[PDB]
Amino acid sequence: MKTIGILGGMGPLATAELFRRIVIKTPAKRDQEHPKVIIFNNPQIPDRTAYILGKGEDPRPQLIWTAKRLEECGADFIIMPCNTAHAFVEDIRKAIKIPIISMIEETAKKVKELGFKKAGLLATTGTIVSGVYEKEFSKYGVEIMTPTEDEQKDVMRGIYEGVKAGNLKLGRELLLKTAKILEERGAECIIAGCTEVSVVLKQDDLKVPLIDPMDVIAEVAVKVALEK
Amino acid sequence: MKTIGILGGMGPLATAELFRRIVIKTPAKRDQEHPKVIIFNNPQIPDRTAYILGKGEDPRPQLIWTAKRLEECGADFIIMPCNTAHAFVEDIRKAIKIPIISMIEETAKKVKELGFKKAGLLATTGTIVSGVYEKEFSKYGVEIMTPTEDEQKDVMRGIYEGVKAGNLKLGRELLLKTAKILEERGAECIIAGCTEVSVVLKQDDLKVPLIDPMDVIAEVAVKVALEK
């Protein structure tokens, strides 16, 4: 058995959703068969996007602090429910002894294993600018495709002012329209970069595989926790 | 600001749900305004009901061990997303230094504050046998009303063979029917003793207030974490 450590708070809601998915994706008939999970939800970690752009506070000190605390509290490995935070995965790795399993890298590995060569990405602008998906996917020979700047404004509006704001119709309209556009351009799979995307967008709305990075990391974490 | 500690794993899904509700009930303009939360999800704690009904080992030693680890990790106070575990709340409190806020007692306080004198309880048989709600509600002068033995079997079926199995139609059919029976017998409010109840039973379905203990403890935890 290995204890799953979750470095969260980026944001709180995404952290709670990752935890729920781990539980749902756990094969068990009784409580006692589920893996141990230690979550340190630290919302005070400075905004990742604001820093990426070059004007906000460095989020690495709090990120590293949280990683070290999880280790001290008993985690055997760490996962993070935040795309942009993975831009500092190497910084965090250098400060701790236990490993961090990357949600971005595991998704790239999965995409490669399924044979896809081109992937359409639906995510926040901060995520794209951070380049985390582009970096890891390229390492695995997979080409990333994103919407145009105008279309990206729609993705952002659909995710924030749409889903997150409680306006599902506006979110699904903006996000589904963009998903099919990427498919039209040759995307072999669609990457649901934010949980908000999986809410209003379902596999039944697309002709190509729909991949949710949070499901990928939750599945990897469960496997490692139960098989190691 | 105080760090909320959650002694979980009883069971994993309920722990994840308590966390989500804390986030949902937190007033904030940005992530950084949300309180820190440390969750020690330990599914290996011995079954509570089993010990209650006398066919299982004592869960206190490991409940206490988990609470101590949670305290060591950094929690300023502890809450537990499990009804039966509260049967041992005094044992846990005596063993640790930080406070434990009882979901059962805070619910009893809320019910009295709202002027109810009789409450219909929808929960597991184990919860009823433990008597935690009866003990606390009586302290605050509120009378508890539960289903008959046969109706209680329907409740257990609705929660387990229904909601937990993914069959919401069965879950709702059995739970709504029992809720209405309790209303007919004079229940001034319905206590949703399990998160499963809140999934298929909504306020609009009843002529009396639906009180969810998990929402109550979530609200208290947020208040205490951000107050004074």
B41 touches chain A (CB under 8 A): yes
Same domain, B74 and B111: no
Same domain, A71 and A109: no
For residue B26, the chain A residues in CB contact (below 8 A) are 12
Q: What distance in Å separates the CA atoms of residue A193 and residue A120, rounded to the nearest whole number?
A: 10
Q: What distance in Å separates the CA atoms of residue A155 and residue A153, rounded to the nearest whole number?
A: 6
Q: What distance in Å separates the CA atoms of residue B65 and residue B42, rounded to the nearest whole number?
A: 10
Residue B83 annotated as part of some ligand binding site: yes
Same domain, B1 and B99: yes
Same domain, A11 and A31: yes
Write out the residue range of the structural domain in which residue A19 sits: 1-104+214-228
- Distance spanning both ends of chain A, measured CA to CA: 6
Resolution in A: 1.9
Same domain, B75 and B154: no
Same domain, A88 and A186: no
A170 touches chain B (CB under 8 A): no
Residue in B with minimal Cα distance to A68: B73
Instruction: For residue A25, give both structure tokens.
Output: 């994706």
Same domain, B64 and B89: yes
Structural domains in chain A (count): 2
Three-class secondary structure of residue B149 per DSSP:
helix
Cβ-based neighbours of B54, under 8 Å, separated by 6 or more: none
Beta bridge partners of B37: A41, B4
Residue in B with minimal Cα distance to A1: B44
Residue A41 annotated as part of some ligand binding site: no
Same domain, B138 and B92: no
Burial (CB count <10 Å: 0-12, 13-18, 19+), residue A226: middle
Using alpha carbons only, what angle is made at residue B102 by residues B100 and B107, rounded to the nearest 5 degrees?
155
Contact A31, B47 (CB under 8 A): yes
Same domain, A78 and A177: no
Contact B77, B103 (CB under 8 A): no
Task: Choose among A12, A32, A45: nearest Cβ to B23.
Answer: A12
> How many Cβ pairs within 8 Å bridge chains A and B?
106
For residue A75, the chain B residues in CB contact (below 8 A) are none
CATH code, domain with A10: 3.40.50.1860
Q: What distance in Å separates the CA atoms of residue A226 and residue A27, rounded to the nearest whole number?
A: 10
**Do residue A34 and residue B11 have CB atoms under 8 angstroms apart?**
yes
Which residues of B participate in catalysis according to the annotation?
82, 194
Same domain, A56 and A140: no
What's the longest Cα–Cα distance across chain A? 50
The residue type of B162 is: G
Same domain, B141 and B206: yes
Same domain, A181 and A207: yes
B85 touches chain A (CB under 8 A): no
